[PDB]
From a paper:
Argonautes can be classified into two major clades: AGO and PIWI. The PIWI clade, on the other hand, is restricted to animals and further confined to the gonads, often displaying strong sex-specific expression patterns. Together with their 24- to 30-nt Piwi-interacting RNAs (piRNAs), they control transposon activity and are essential for fertility in animals.
To extend these studies, we crystallized the MID domain (S480-E616) of mouse MIWI, which binds primary piRNAs with a strong 1U-bias (∼90%). The final structure was refined to 2.3 Å-resolution using the native data. The overall structure of the MIWI MID domain reveals a Rossmann fold composed of alternating β-strands and α-helices that form a pocket capable of accommodating a single nucleotide. It strongly resembles those found in prokaryotic and eukaryotic AGO proteins; nevertheless, the superimposition of MIWI and hAgo2 MID domains highlights differences in the orientation of several secondary structural elements and loops. Comparison of the MIWI MID-UMP docking structure to that of hAgo2 MID-UMP shows that a group of conserved residues allow interaction with the 5′ phosphate group (MIWI residues: Y569, K573, Q585, and K604) and stacking of the base with a tyrosine (Y569 in MIWI). The main difference occurs in the position of the specificity loop, which forces the base to change orientation. Docked AMP can also enter the binding pocket and makes a stacking interaction with Y569 but fails to engage N564 in the specificity loop via hydrogen bonding, as seen with docked UMP. Thus, our docking studies suggest that the MIWI MID domain can optimally accommodate a 5′ uridine in the nucleotide-binding pocket, conferring an inherent ability to the protein in accumulating 1U-containing RNAs.
Author numbering:
A (entry chain C): 485 to 610
B (entry chain A): 486 to 612
Write the structure that this text describes.
Amino acid sequence: GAPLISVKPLDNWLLIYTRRNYEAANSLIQNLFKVTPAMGIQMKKAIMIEVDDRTEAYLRALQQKVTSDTQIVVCLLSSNRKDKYDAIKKYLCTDCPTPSQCVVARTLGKQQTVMAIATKIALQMN
Amino acid sequence: APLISVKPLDNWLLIYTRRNYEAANSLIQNLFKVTPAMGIQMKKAIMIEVDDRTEAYLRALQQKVTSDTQIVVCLLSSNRKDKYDAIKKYLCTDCPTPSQCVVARTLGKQQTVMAIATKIALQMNCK
């Protein structure tokens, strides 16, 4: 036979992060692996993009890596630094057609933060 | 004391223009119908009538969106690209509260209603 239960594969997506948060990025992938089956989603590993911690490096990585095939984009930020956050958000929102979201590394400890992120992804996949 | 847990949706905004006053009322009623199956207990939206121009939508947003606002829904007279794009962009850059735009025309389907409610159930779990 072959599966009967609907899943949605999340196989092509970007996680853009800065070296200081290398391990909070890895943990996020694992955690999302845990909560994602309950939501009808089958996850592959994110395409991971390490950038210098500056606005412009995030934006470059965006212009170079986002494709037709990219399903979701997640920008992990070192900090809730208003200007950096606002300038990435503005660009994703005007220039990036691919659904996206920003996350501040700090909040990542919490399992409610993880759930919210996955929820937003489930949402963007429709 | 009532044992089944429900997510109350008691503070939220519907911004619409006078021409779609009734399509707006209907949308509330219909959402009342399909929302209990999703674990949500709905109150009526705070309804905000605005003139049919981009800027009027944006003023309403700046004035009425609060810490308490759970969801924002902008119902548009038309799929007019510029108006739709400008409102979408602004919500997306300047409005932290989760939101969506709906074109009145499409409200004439129970699949449209389901999609909006689905999106809301989803937005009720976000940071």
